[PDB]
Structure formats: structure tokens, C-alpha cells
Amino acid sequence: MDSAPFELFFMINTSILLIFIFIVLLIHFEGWRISFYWNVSVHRVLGFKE
Secondary structure: OOOOHHHHHOOOOHHHHHHHHHHHHHHHHHHHHHHHOOOOOHHHHHHHHO
């Protein structure tokens, strides 16, 4: 089963690259969803977590 991502990075370097591209990209498309999902506090869930 897929789990333990932190350890996965120790495998290859690309792992961090891809995630870095997908992550930074997602936030771009999510930035707009912030409105539709205003009722929810998904963003805050990560804002404080990070």
C-alpha cells in the first residue's frame, strides 16, 4: 500500500520535483475554488498546519 511519503523522497530526487510542480500548480487552480468553498475552512486547515 502507498504510504510514508517522507521516506519516499529519500528514494529519488524527482519525487520532490513532481510534487513541487503539482503542488504549486494545484494551489493555482484552488485559489479560485476558495470562493465556491468559502463555507468550508479547507485553506485554513493547511494555513495553520504548515
